[PDB]
Write a protein that binds this ligand. Structure first.
Ligand SMILES: CC(C)(C)n1nc(-c2ccc3ccccc3c2)c2c(N)ncnc21
Length: 462
């Protein structure tokens, strides 16, 4: 008898979105153990390996243990999804902790990189490669100041094909090793990516940058970088020597993770116990992160509007089919089956796969619109409220990211800032400039939140 994910775990809430799918906070129905479950949709994510080799990898991943690697507990598969059940970490993404700090030094950078290299070293010893190591794969175990870094997604890229969509690709290009682009790669690609992260920790700027994804990739492929920014004079020679060794082009000549742990810089800056703060780096990192998160948020918002266009008409068609008399009236149980159908096929809400969760969601919608749950209900009104709820939630989510980005509380994003944001979002320059011209009818060279939102709607066919 095949084990079923929903027989064991109940979803608590959505934690967020990472490579290959959504991540839900779930709870064991017997033991109360909380876990983070990555839900991978088989429709949206292609497997690179056969069923056999995935199961073997899962079996190995479950037996591995290292304080800087996410612990994997369980693996399930049904007709539409894979469910990877791992340990929940509450400290958030590393870069989001770093920007909140008042000070940041080479000591703090070295302690971070030692952890990352320690985890990588351990995984490489077990023949597992990450390939997609980047700052958002570095979580802090908890919100404690001394919290360990946990690397997420080790081994997934070997089995699952990366998305080609920009909403899924934000940030990837800065960190990818050149050899990954060309097709022949091995565990050394993780050292390159860690070298890129280190470069960013110490200067707050990517070593390989550009105005759009392809220009970033062209720089990565050339493999050349400099330490000629003003940030770099504050920085020890040994740190730059380690970075050089990690950003060595030919992988056979590149330093291994284990040898990087013995490097002078790691040895000097992580030992027992006066190092100056890297203030310009923190400032740069603040700006870098803010830009990445707004571009991410903008893409997410556009995707949510498109998903709504899709799901709003489908849900209406599902209920119309169920409505035998054509009176427009369905009961709660029918609303639940109709909503269930919608969720199974679309797979845009991993939290709505369990039937109990859909029952709960319908009751939340019904409770919102003052409809009695025990009688017959006008479905067209339920559809409106259920979709309007989602639409409101999406807009609120974009706004929070707009406010986050607007660090001086100006209420505006300048035209220069839009260029950077849309460049990161890989929205064509002539296209957004054109949309900006339709919205900014007075050449102010800046947009407030509503205007930014209007641009995004125009940039997804509205
Ligand atoms: C940041 C956020 C919401 C995207 N996230 N993501 C995870 C996470 C990442 C990769 C996984 C791979 C296999 C199984 C579970 C996984 C969970 C994760 C986590 N464990 N704990 C906290 N947040 C997490």
């Amino acid at each position: 008898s095949t084990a079923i994910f929903s027989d064991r775990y109940k979803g608590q809430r959505v934690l967020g979105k990472g490579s290959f799918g959504e991540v839900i906070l779930c709870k064991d129905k017997i033991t109360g153990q909380e876990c983070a479950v990555k839900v991978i949709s088989k429709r949206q994510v292609k497997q690179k390996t056969d069923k056999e080799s995935l199961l073997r990898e899962v079996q190995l991943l479950k037996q591995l243990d290292h304080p800087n690697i996410m612990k994997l507990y369980e693996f399930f598969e049904d007709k539409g999804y894979f469910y990877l059940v791992g340990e929940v970490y509450t400290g958030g993404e590393l870069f989001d902790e770093i920007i909140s700090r008042k000070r940041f030094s080479e000591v703090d950078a070295a302690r971070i990189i030692r952890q990352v290299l320690s985890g990588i070293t351990y995984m490489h010893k077990n023949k597992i490669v990450h390939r997609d190591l980047k700052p958002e794969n570095l979580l802090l175990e908890s919100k404690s100041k001394d919290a360990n870094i946990r690397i997420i997604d080790f081994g997934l890229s070997t089995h699952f094909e990366a998305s080609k969509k920009m909403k899924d690709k934000i940030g990837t290009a800065y960190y990818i090793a050149p050899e990954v682009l060309h097709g022949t790669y091995d565990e050394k690609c993780d050292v390159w990516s860690t070298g890129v992260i280190l470069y960013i920790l110490l200067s707050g700027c990517p070593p390989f940058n550009g105005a759009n994804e392809y220009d970033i990739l062209k720089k990565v492929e050339k493999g050349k970088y400099t330490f000629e920014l003003p940030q770099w004079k504050k920085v020890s020679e040994s740190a730059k020597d380690l970075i050089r060794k990690m950003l060595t082009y030919v992988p056979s000549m590149r330093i291994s993770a284990r040898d990087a742990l013995d490097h002078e810089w790691i040895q000097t800056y992580t030992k027992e116990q006066d190092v100056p703060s890297l203030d310009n780096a923190i400032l740069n990192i603040r700006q870098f992160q803010g830009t990445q998160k707004l571009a991410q948020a903008a893409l997410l918002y556009m995707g949510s509007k498109l998903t709504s266009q899709d799901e709003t008409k489908e849900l209406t068609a599902i209920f119309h089919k169920m409505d035998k008399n054509g009176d427009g009236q369905l009961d709660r149980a029918e609303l639940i089956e109709g909503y269930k159908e919608l969720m199974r096929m679309k797979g845009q809400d991993a939290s709505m796969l369990d039937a109990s969760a859909v029952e709960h969601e319908v009751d939340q919608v019904l409770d919102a619109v003052d409809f009695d749950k025990n009688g017959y209900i006008e479905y067209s009104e339920f559809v409106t409220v259920a979709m309007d709820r989602k639409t409101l939630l999406s807009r609120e989510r974009l706004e929070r990211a707009f406010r986050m980005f607007d660090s001086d509380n100006s209420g505006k994003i300048s035209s220069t800032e839009l260029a950077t944001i849309f460049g990161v979002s890989d929205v064509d320059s002539e296209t957004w400039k054109s949309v900006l011209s339709e919205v900014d009818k007075n050449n102010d060279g800046e947009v407030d939140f509503d205007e930014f939102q209007q641009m995004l709607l125009k940039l997804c066919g509205n």
